[PDB]
């Protein structure tokens, strides 16, 4: 009953900026927590950032702290990831996941096709 669609990826130079969107549809009220995760081909899953929609608390990967900012627009029903000072390590597919509770990484689901970001 809940869908998440990612958009806003692309190719940028090192130090550039991109702004990735997670548009949610359906009855998303139950999902209080939203997270952005990325996967390069060779490597495994990692969570760049997460946000609590009700509280506003946020968490960030140590690498992304300072360069990435997570925000939400309730009217848009969208969660946004702002990537500044992009680095080649940032290159991978990006997706947004959602869950009722924040204890664990699984309860987040409903993530879409994702967006490709390449830093060169």
């Amino acid at each position: 009953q809940v869908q998440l669609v990612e958009s806003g990826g692309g190719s940028v130079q090192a130090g550039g900026s991109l702004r990735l969107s997670c548009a949610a549809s359906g009855y998303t009220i139950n999902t209080d927590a939203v997270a952005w995760f990325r996967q390069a081909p060779g490597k495994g899953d990692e969570r760049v950032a997460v946000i609590y929609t009700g509280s506003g608390n946020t968490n960030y990967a140590d690498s992304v702290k300072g360069r990435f900012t997570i925000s939400q627009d309730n009217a848009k029903n969208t969660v946004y990831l702002q990537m500044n000072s992009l680095k080649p390590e940032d290159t991978a597919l990006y997706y947004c996941a959602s869950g009722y509770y924040g204890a664990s990484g699984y309860d987040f689901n409903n993530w879409g096709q994702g967006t490709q970001v390449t830093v060169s």
């Binding site: 664990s104 990484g105 699984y106």
Partner: peptide, 15 residues
Amino acid sequence: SASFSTFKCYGVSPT
């Protein structure tokens, strides 16, 4: 580890 898409624990808190 943060490499698991998933760690949903039932009956036990993960930490």
